[PDB]
Amino acid sequence: SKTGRKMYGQKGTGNARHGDRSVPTFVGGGVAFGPKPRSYDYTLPRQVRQLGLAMAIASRQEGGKLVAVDGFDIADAKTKNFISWAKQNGLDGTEKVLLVTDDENTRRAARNVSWVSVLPVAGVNVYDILRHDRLVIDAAALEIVEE
Amino acid sequence: HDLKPTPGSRKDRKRVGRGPGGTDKTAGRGHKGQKSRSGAGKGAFFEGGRSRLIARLPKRGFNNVGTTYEVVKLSQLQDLEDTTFDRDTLEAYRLVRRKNRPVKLLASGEISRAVTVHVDAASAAAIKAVEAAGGRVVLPE
Amino acid sequence: PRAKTGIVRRRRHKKVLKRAKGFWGSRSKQYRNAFQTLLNAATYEYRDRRNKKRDFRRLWIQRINAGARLHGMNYSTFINGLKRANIDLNRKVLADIAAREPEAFKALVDASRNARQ
RNA sequence: GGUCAAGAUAGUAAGGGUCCACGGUGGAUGCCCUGGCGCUGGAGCCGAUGAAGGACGCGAUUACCUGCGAAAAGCCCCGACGAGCUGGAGAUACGCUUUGACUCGGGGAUGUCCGAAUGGGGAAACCCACCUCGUAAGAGGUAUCCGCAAGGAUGGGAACUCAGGGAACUGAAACAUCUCAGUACCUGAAGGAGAAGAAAGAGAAUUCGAUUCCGUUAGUAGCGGCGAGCGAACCCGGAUCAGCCCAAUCAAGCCGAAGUGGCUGGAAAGCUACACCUCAGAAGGUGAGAGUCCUGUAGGCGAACGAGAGGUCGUUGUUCGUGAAACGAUGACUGAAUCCGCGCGGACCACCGCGCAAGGCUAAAUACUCCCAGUGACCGAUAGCGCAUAGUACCGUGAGGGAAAGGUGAAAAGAACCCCGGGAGGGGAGUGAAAGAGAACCUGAAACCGUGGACUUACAAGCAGUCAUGGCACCUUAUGCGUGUUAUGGCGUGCCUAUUGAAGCAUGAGCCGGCGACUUAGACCUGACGUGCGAGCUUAAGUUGAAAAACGGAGGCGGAGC
RNA sequence: AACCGAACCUGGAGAUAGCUAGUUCUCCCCGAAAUGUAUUGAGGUACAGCCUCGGAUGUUGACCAUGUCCUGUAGAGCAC
RNA sequence: GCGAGAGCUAACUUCCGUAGCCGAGAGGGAAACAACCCAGACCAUCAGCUAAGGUCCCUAAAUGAUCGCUCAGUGGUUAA
RNA sequence: GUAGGGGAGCGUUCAGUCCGCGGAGAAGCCAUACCGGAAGGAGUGGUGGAGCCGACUGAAGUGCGGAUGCCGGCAUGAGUAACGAUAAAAGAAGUGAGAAUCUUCUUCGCCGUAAGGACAAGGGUUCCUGGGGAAGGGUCGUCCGCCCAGGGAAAGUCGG
RNA sequence: CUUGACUGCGAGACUGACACGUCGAGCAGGGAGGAAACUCGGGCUUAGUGAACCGGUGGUACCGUGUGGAAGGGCCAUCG
Numbered sequence A: 001s002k003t004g005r006k007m008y009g010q011k012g013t014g015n016a017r018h019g020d021r022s023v024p025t026f027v028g029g030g031v032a033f034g035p036k037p038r039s040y041d042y043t044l045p046r047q048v049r050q051l052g053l054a055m056a057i058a059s060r061q062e063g064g065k066l067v068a069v070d071g072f073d074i075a076d077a078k079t080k081n082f083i084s085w086a087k088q089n090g091l092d093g094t095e096k097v098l099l100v101t102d103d104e105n106t107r108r109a110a111r112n113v114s115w116v117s118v119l120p121v122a123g124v125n126v127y128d129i130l131r132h133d134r135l136v137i138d139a140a141a142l143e144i145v146e147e
Numbered sequence B: 001h002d003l004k005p006t007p008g009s010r011k012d013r014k015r016v017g018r019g020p021g022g023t024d025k026t027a028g029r030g031h032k033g034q035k036s037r038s039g040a041g042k043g044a045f046f047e048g049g050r051s052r053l054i055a056r057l058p059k060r061g062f063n064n065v066g067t068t069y070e071v072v073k074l075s076q077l078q079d080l081e082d083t084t085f086d087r088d089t090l091e092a093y094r095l096v097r098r099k100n101r102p103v104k105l106l107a108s109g110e111i112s113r114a115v116t117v118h119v120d121a122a123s124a125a126a127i128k129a130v131e132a133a134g135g136r137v138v139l140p141e
Numbered sequence C: 001p002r003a004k005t006g007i008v009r010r011r012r013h014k015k016v017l018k019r020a021k022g023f024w025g026s027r028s029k030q031y032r033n034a035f036q037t038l039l040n041a042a043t044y045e046y047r048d049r050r051n052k053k054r055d056f057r058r059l060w061i062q063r064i065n066a067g068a069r070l071h072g073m074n075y076s077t078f079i080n081g082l083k084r085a086n087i088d089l090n091r092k093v094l095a096d097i098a099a100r101e102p103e104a105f106k107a108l109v110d111a112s113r114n115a116r117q
Numbered sequence D: 001g002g003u004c005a006a007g008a009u010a011g012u013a014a015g016g017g018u019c020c021a022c023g024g025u026g027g028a029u030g031c032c033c034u035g036g037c038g039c040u041g042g043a044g045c046c047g048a049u050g051a052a053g054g055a056c057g058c059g060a061u062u063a064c065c066u067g068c069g070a071a072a073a074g075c076c077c078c079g080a081c082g083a084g085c086u087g088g089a090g091a092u093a094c095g096c097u098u099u100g101a102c103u104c105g106g107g108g109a110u111g112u113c114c115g116a117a118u119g120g121g122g123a124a125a126c127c128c129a130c131c132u133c134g135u136a137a138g139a140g141g142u143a144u145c146c147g148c149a150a151g152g153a154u155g156g157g158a159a160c161u162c163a164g165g166g167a168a169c170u171g172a173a174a175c176a177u178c179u180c181a182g183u184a185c186c187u188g189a190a191g192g193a194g195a196a197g198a199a200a201g202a203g204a205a206u207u208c209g210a211u212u213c214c215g216u217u218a219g220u221a222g223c224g225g226c227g228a229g230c231g232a233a234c235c236c237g238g239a240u241c242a243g244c245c246c247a248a249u250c251a252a253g254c255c256g257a258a259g260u261g262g263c264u265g266g267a268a269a270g271c272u273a274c275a276c277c278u279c280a281g282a283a284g285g286u287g288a289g290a291g292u293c294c295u296g297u298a299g300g301c302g303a304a305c306g307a308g309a310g311g312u313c314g315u316u317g318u319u320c321g322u323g324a325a326a327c328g329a330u331g332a333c334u335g336a337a338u339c340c341g342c343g344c345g346g347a348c349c350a351c352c353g354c355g356c357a358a359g360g361c362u363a364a365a366u367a368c369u370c371c372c373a374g375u376g377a378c379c380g381a382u383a384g385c386g387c388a389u390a391g392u393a394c395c396g397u398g399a400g401g402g403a404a405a406g407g408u409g410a411a412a413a414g415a416a417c418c419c420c421g422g423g424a425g426g427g428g429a430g431u432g433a434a435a436g437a438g439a440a441c442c443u444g445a446a447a448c449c450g451u452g453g454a455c456u457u458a459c460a461a462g463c464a465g466u467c468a469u470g471g472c473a474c475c476u477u478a479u480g481c482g483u484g485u486u487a488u489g490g491c492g493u494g495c496c497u498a499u500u501g502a503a504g505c506a507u508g509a510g511c512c513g514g515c516g517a518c519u520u521a522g523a524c525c526u527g528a529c530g531u532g533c534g535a536g537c538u539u540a541a542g543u544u545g546a547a548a549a550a551c552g553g554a555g556g557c558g559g560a561g562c
Numbered sequence E: 001a002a003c004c005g006a007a008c009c010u011g012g013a014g015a016u017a018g019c020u021a022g023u024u025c026u027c028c029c030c031g032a033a034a035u036g037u038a039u040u041g042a043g044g045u046a047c048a049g050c051c052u053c054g055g056a057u058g059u060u061g062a063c064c065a066u067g068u069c070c071u072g073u074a075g076a077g078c079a080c
Numbered sequence F: 001g002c003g004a005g006a007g008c009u010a011a012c013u014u015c016c017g018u019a020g021c022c023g024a025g026a027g028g029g030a031a032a033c034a035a036c037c038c039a040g041a042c043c044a045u046c047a048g049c050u051a052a053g054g055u056c057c058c059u060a061a062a063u064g065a066u067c068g069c070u071c072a073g074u075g076g077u078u079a080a
Numbered sequence G: 001g002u003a004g005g006g007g008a009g010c011g012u013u014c015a016g017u018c019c020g021c022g023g024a025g026a027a028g029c030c031a032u033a034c035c036g037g038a039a040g041g042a043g044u045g046g047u048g049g050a051g052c053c054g055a056c057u058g059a060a061g062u063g064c065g066g067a068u069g070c071c072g073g074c075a076u077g078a079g080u081a082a083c084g085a086u087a088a089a090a091g092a093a094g095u096g097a098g099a100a101u102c103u104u105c106u107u108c109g110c111c112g113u114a115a116g117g118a119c120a121a122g123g124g125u126u127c128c129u130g131g132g133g134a135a136g137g138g139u140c141g142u143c144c145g146c147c148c149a150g151g152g153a154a155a156g157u158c159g160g
Numbered sequence H: 001c002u003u004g005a006c007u008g009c010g011a012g013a014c015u016g017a018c019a020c021g022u023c024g025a026g027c028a029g030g031g032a033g034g035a036a037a038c039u040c041g042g043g044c045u046u047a048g049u050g051a052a053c054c055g056g057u058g059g060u061a062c063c064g065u066g067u068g069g070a071a072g073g074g075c076c077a078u079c080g
């Protein structure tokens, strides 16, 4: 908002020449080469999504920070039960752990945990996994997601 | 955070100007010129002031679209395809895909094992060398 | 995200202004004149490194010339008879001998002359 | 040792110079947020029952703001809250309220004057009326057009939509067809969207089947001083689906788990030893960083009221620039058939196909974003809107232009009181952790002005440096390669830009801060590096889920040239 | 309505600008061009020529002797 | 500098050709001096030999050696 | 080694992530003789008062001496020029913290078809009383057309 | 005496930044003069020229939009 109007004399003043006050070299004026609204997103080709995901799992298997899980004894949706179960599978408390299951109860148990994250069903990604120390595997959709 | 990027898979851009290091002044542009100017349009076919080769030359013919024919090759019905036959959708679910065009079969390779074809048209030497190796060619009505 | 100069410029600048001291007027106090003064100063440093290599050589020389002449010898003749008897002395040293060590210069003289004739 | 003689060198600084110490000026920088900015989503009209927007008023004291309207910082009724309240505003005195105030949600009542203004006039907010009822004080009515009446219209709305009107600069390296572009702007109307819509259609398969939207076909078919340049559609995938009739749950609120001991500290939330909660570890406040103080969150409840035809002539539209010009479209002339009929299939003819003109409405997907909310590899005081707020100050007869503005402390505990002065200002005291925070109140850069100190400077010629040596001074990366300063020497043509050639008597610039310029987009082109699959490679629109991503073959690239 | 051969304001609008300025971090390697040819073109653009990077190739380059043909200048001469 | 043209065997002249140089080249020399003579600066050294060009003092280095010339300050700016 | 192409990197922010520091003190700022081939980066000391360094990776409004550049501050010129008509001032008296300038007195000097008086247009409390003195006043001010507070304006015949 | 002042071509080179331009053996169809071997796709040669575009004209039956036709268009020729 700095109206077009020629400001003063094109020649004559003894001053440098200007046109508007809306200009890159002016305090107040508009920015030259600024950022605008865009979107840095693209479509990374399928192939390498799959190969990554995999390579992550793997990277943590030969770790070996995998814990392939077939069950969960965490009473009714309570957190302390999570902490206990955890304690007895090898979960000291000094790592970041990423749940993948399908049972609402286990998550509801796994949520408030400062040292743990709760990824539901499929929404799994090289990030979260590498983002962490441990994968709560689980087991169900692992050998069947193999095939 | 573990990771790292493939050596040479990301080149850091050029920010021209900035020092004598460095690309001093000018910004690649040299001293003066029409090229020197913050302004679009030049463009790419603008030779001289002038009149261009481009428009100095004979306009021959015109532009007909026409029916253009989809290639099928001998050495592709041949070798290790082990005749699952051509059928219709079958060759499609293999390695000859377009739609809204007619398929043509023509030579290139050699011929052995007997096969019957299912194409929209074909070359003389093709029907010739495929019958002479044990199989027909189905041309529509 | 935008990134003001914030800090960097003051940094660069001070660097110069700390190189820039002892300098007379504005030179030691305003950036532009400072950095500038230093461009030229650069020229003078480089050249005057090799230069002092010349100048000292000159100094040694005149001291030896003296020495020679202090008896009856020319510089050129002394130094030449000190090439002839192969007495391969640096001339910096020769100056040293000449001005801090009398009777030694005496002998080196008698030598050069002997080897000359 | 005195006199004379010859010769050599010292000290003083009016002032200045270099360095150092110490303030001043100023307000860069760091920190912070009370203000922005964009994206997603929600929500979307007001008004003759007087709108937007104002003028003047209402206060114990009232200039600005805010709220309000002569019932005038408020009034009645209901509902939530339960202890404070008496607007920012920080001030006294007056008071109010557990019979339930204040604040919140929800209706009502009162609402001067101006403004579509509308009883008539008027230079908006003022002047003068006429009529009906009243005892007066008052109250109502008195515009204009459509109407029998009842009733509707007038004016406003950032953009969004439709329509009547319709530029130029520009580009074609000149210009005129042409391009800019039916763009800017003007105007009309209307809504929360609108427009469009139920085939004389696309069309070429004897296929689809109202429209609008996106993907795609596709920079393909074509247009063009065949120059610049301009550029479809059918099909294929999605979004959302509709076709009807006539003329012979959110909006106030409530309820919600679980820690203490010692330690540093001005201050605990931090350190520590042991604790418990979690469907609650999102966040914010508390003397410095709190899962377990507070407000909250997960969760659970949740209201009386509340919200869901043809032809001819001049032309033009689509890719349509008179080109073979079809068709629609209208200005002026003409104005046929109605079923064994009418219209189209890009001149025109037969054939053979697709179609029912002359009558109307239509949700849905779509566009926008004044406003509300959520987020952020968006900004934090030259940024960010113009504004930490203000369209104000200021300029302009007017249209219109239009600023800089931020920070005491944890809390005012805001400095009683003594001292010099009329004061201003300061020096104590006293508070605080700190007054190295004291209201010109966070840091406090640099230019710039000064006090003190070191070493120097009054026979000297200078881009102000360099380099060598001597002097003097200093000793916290620092007693040696030293550091500060200096005398003497050698040497030496500011920087930038512009150029055949710059110290140039050629351009620029007082100095220092801070802002200041090779970028973004497209799923275009072509290359280099890399990667994943590899005679194979790949999705887009969308769909679903979304503290993540998967689905999506419609199309694209390779496949064979001429 | 304080500068009228075409008011001022807002807007298209960041019109265009073959023109003039300006274009900031550092070290290393290479390293030009102001010639030709066209151009409503002459202080501007196209293509070559010249730089540089990289993939191919293999001594094809370069100077120098030899051998071998082409020439009509310097000098000279008066045969047109 | 050498070749020629236009000029006036004028120009810090202009238009070609040709070699080198500056342009884009610092260092020594020519007092001073883009072009000239020597020479192509990867840093360090208070180390040595040379080039052009120099060796009375300024100013490094023979006031050198022998056979001579000019006496005019020629040297240290021109001609019939 | 100029235009130019190539090579490796220094610093700035925002971001993901880890190492981790901080009221026995963060960033920022200030001094310095250390280190790195350079962009740069460390040690310690003084400042400050609540936040921040480092490694790896990602994205940029990413590095200024120039543009007669823009905003702001402060320098030069300089204690210079000027203090706005050459109608002209003196002495006494008073007041005050302070007086060439403000208030009395007595004179002098200037206007007098004005430099007097009354209206209109315009301005808007500038009027009067009491007070103030930061700034406005071209010096000074105890004074004012400036600051504060309070008062003042009256129509049937003037004017609409 | 004659119509090589010829169709269909083009080995290989000169030349030019490009576009052009220049020479040409030889092959075919089919000719001309010689009795023949032969020679000829213009003149002793080097000047006697104008790219595209839009259009006229003589062939040609490649395109012609539901289909078969015609407009129109393409190709060879050519004229401005």
Ligand SMILES: [Mg+2]
Residues within 6 Å of the ligand: A014
């Ligand atoms: Mg000036």
Ligand SMILES: [Mg+2]
Residues within 6 Å of the ligand: B022, B023
């Ligand atoms: Mg580069």
Ligand SMILES: [Mg+2]
Residues within 6 Å of the ligand: B031, B032
């Ligand atoms: Mg330039």
Ligand SMILES: [Mg+2]
Residues within 6 Å of the ligand: B031, B032
């Ligand atoms: Mg040039």
Ligand SMILES: [Mg+2]
Residues within 6 Å of the ligand: C054
């Ligand atoms: Mg040497």
Ligand SMILES: [Mg+2]
Residues within 6 Å of the ligand: none
């Ligand atoms: Mg003094």
Ligand SMILES: [Mg+2]
Residues within 6 Å of the ligand: none
């Ligand atoms: Mg008000």
Ligand SMILES: [Mg+2]
Residues within 6 Å of the ligand: none
């Ligand atoms: Mg109530």
Ligand SMILES: [Mg+2]
Residues within 6 Å of the ligand: D081, D103
């Ligand atoms: Mg309450």
Ligand SMILES: [Mg+2]
Residues within 6 Å of the ligand: D110
């Ligand atoms: Mg009332």
Ligand SMILES: [Mg+2]
Residues within 6 Å of the ligand: D117
């Ligand atoms: Mg009225």
Ligand SMILES: [Mg+2]
Residues within 6 Å of the ligand: none
């Ligand atoms: Mg024009």
Ligand SMILES: [Mg+2]
Residues within 6 Å of the ligand: D171
């Ligand atoms: Mg033009």
Ligand SMILES: [Mg+2]
Residues within 6 Å of the ligand: none
């Ligand atoms: Mg309207």
Ligand SMILES: [Mg+2]
Residues within 6 Å of the ligand: none
């Ligand atoms: Mg017509």
Ligand SMILES: [Mg+2]
Residues within 6 Å of the ligand: D316
């Ligand atoms: Mg038209």
